[PDB]
């Protein structure tokens, strides 16, 4: 990357009027003495006693590739699944012209890491200029909040050094 | 549906799996909302299940088809089972092997 623009792909306060957007924090991602969460993702949960099917699309009008990241939460019990998302039978689907995937919840007793027996899987894609990405879900979606429009360049890489820049 | 390879050489078998954009179209085409495709030989074994997702239209189609292949050794059998979404093999290819070949891109005349 030679430049990028971070931008609010799906603004928190307006993108999700029918789902809960303020209950999406956890002690595994604690900050400054309080539970928190990733700044670039948004943990949607059920509002009241219902999680209706969401459908949300983004058209890339940035004139360059946009990197979109998202996640899928996998609770430890059918009881916690149900308790968070209402729908026992939930899925998440994500598609663009070139990307296409269906995700289904993985409920498993498993050990705790950073206090959580649940797991979250993280996914990403590069959305080409002019193309559209569409998210549909009946639960378990960790929604994009901010994404990054990228300018590409060759032959670099990553090193580890404690020397001062 | 099964095929026994009596060709005396590897047979390249290709097939596909269709992925409609909605459950309504899946159901409308294949009747079964919950369809799958399984393909197996003595050495090959894979299950494909429609992955239904809203997505934009490409070449007029919001649907997608994924394409798959395997090499069936002489004397071996390949078996296809499906309750929908199978783009079935029609023609396949018996192959003769050789080392050290490859592909180039050129507009020069042959």
């Amino acid at each position: 990357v030679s430049s990028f623009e971070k931008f609010e792909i799906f603004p928190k306060t307006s993108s999700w009027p029918n789902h809960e957007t303020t209950k999406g924090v956890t002690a595994a991602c604690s900050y400054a003495g309080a539970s928190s969460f990733y700044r670039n993702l948004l943990w949607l949960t059920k509002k009241g006693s219902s999680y209706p099917k969401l459908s949300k699309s983004y058209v890339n009008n940035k004139g360059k590739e946009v990197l979109v990241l998202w996640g899928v939460h996998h609770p430890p019990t059918g009881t916690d699944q149900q308790s968070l998302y209402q729908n026992a039978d939930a899925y998440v689907s994500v598609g663009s012209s070139k990307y296409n995937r269906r995700f289904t919840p993985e409920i498993a007793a498993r050990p705790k890491v950073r206090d959580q027996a649940g797991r979250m899987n993280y996914y990403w894609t590069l959305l080409e200029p002019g193309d559209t990405i569409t998210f549909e879900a009946t639960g378990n979606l960790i929604a994009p909040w901010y994404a990054f429009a990228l300018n590409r360049g060759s032959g670099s890489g990553i090193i580890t050094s404690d020397a001062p820049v | 549906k099964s095929y026994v390879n009596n060709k005396g050489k590897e047979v390249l078998v290709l097939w596909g799996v269709h992925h409609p954009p909605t459950g309504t179209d899946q159901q409308s085409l294949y009747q079964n909302a919950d369809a799958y495709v399984s393909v197996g030989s003595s050495k090959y074994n894979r299950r494909f299940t429609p992955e239904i997702a809203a997505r934009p239209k490409v070449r007029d189609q919001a649907g997608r088809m994924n394409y798959y292949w395997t090499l069936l050794e002489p004397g071996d059998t390949i078996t296809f089972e499906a309750t929908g979404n199978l783009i079935a093999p029609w023609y396949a290819f018996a192959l003769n092997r050789g080392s050290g070949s490859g592909i180039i891109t050129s507009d020069a005349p042959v």
Epitope: - | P20, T24, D60, G63
Partner: antibody, heavy 126, light 112 residues
Framework: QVQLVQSGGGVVQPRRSLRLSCAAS????????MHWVRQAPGKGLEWVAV????????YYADSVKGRFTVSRDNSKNTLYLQMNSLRAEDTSVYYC???????????????????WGQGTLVTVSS | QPVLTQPPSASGSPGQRVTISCSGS????????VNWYQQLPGTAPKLLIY???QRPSGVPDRFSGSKSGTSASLAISGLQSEDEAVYYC????????????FGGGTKLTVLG
């Protein structure tokens, strides 16, 4: 929430024109054909027209063929029906509806799906 | 036909089964699938059955479609009070300028 909302209906004199609009939310509008269907008070359903996702294809009922023109603007998630040369018998509640299937199959064709708006009434009299 | 042929009316007692026929031609039903819709008073039509025999989410399984030749039929088992409505069939038609054809509708009464 999947929704279509029609507007533009009202009273009009014959031979005059009126434009109806339908605003969509909650599904990928630009991915679906859209139909107009009408129903006269106390009468049955009558298909009016269909338009493809991209506006490239349009079909009309013969009773309105040559008089009405259907169009859409995917950027506003709005479908339109332009009604010209109105007659008294065009009086009806007009519905817009999302097409049954997202993809076109030449052995299946077009038909109205599960999503209909509440309808808007158009009255043509003297 | 410009309009698919349906009986004007139908009726049944609670608990009973009722069928509604829909007759067309080679250019519609003989070539393309049939949809069924249910309309309650003062409300938009509801999609009931598509691809002849299939039900959208929310539609109980006591609704089933079938066909034979150029005619189709909708069956409703275990009739309920809430079923009183007008039922419409429809199909694509490739005659003339291609178009959708609706049936004339069937008012189903559960005598109450």
């Amino acid at each position: 929430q999947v929704q279509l909302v029609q507007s533009g209906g009202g009273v009009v004199q014959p031979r005059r024109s009126l434009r109806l609009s339908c605003a969509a939310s909650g599904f990928t509008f630009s991915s679906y054909a859209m139909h107009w269907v009408r129903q006269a008070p106390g009468k049955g359903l009558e298909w009016v027209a269909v338009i493809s996702y991209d506006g490239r294809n349009k079909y009309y009922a013969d009773s309105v063929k040559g008089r009405f023109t259907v169009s859409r603007d995917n950027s506003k998630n709005t479908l339109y029906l332009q009604m010209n040369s109105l007659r008294a018998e065009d009086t009806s509640v007009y519905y817009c509806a999302r097409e049954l299937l997202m993809d076109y199959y030449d052995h299946i064709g077009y038909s109205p799906g599960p999503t209909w708006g509440q309808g808007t009434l158009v009255t043509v009299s003297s | 036909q410009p309009v698919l042929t349906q009986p004007p009316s139908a009726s049944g007692s609670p608990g009973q089964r009722v069928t509604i026929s829909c007759s067309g031609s080679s250019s519609n039903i003989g070539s393309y699938t049939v949809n069924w819709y249910q309309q309650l008073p003062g409300t938009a039509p509801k999609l009931l059955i598509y691809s002849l025999n299939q039900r959208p989410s929310g539609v109980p399984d006591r609704f089933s479609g079938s066909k034979s030749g150029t005619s189709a039929s909708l069956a409703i088992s275990g009739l309920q009070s809430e079923d009183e409505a007008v039922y419409y069939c429809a199909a694509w038609d490739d005659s003339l300028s291609a178009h959708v054809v609706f049936g004339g509708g069937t008012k189903l009464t559960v005598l109450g």
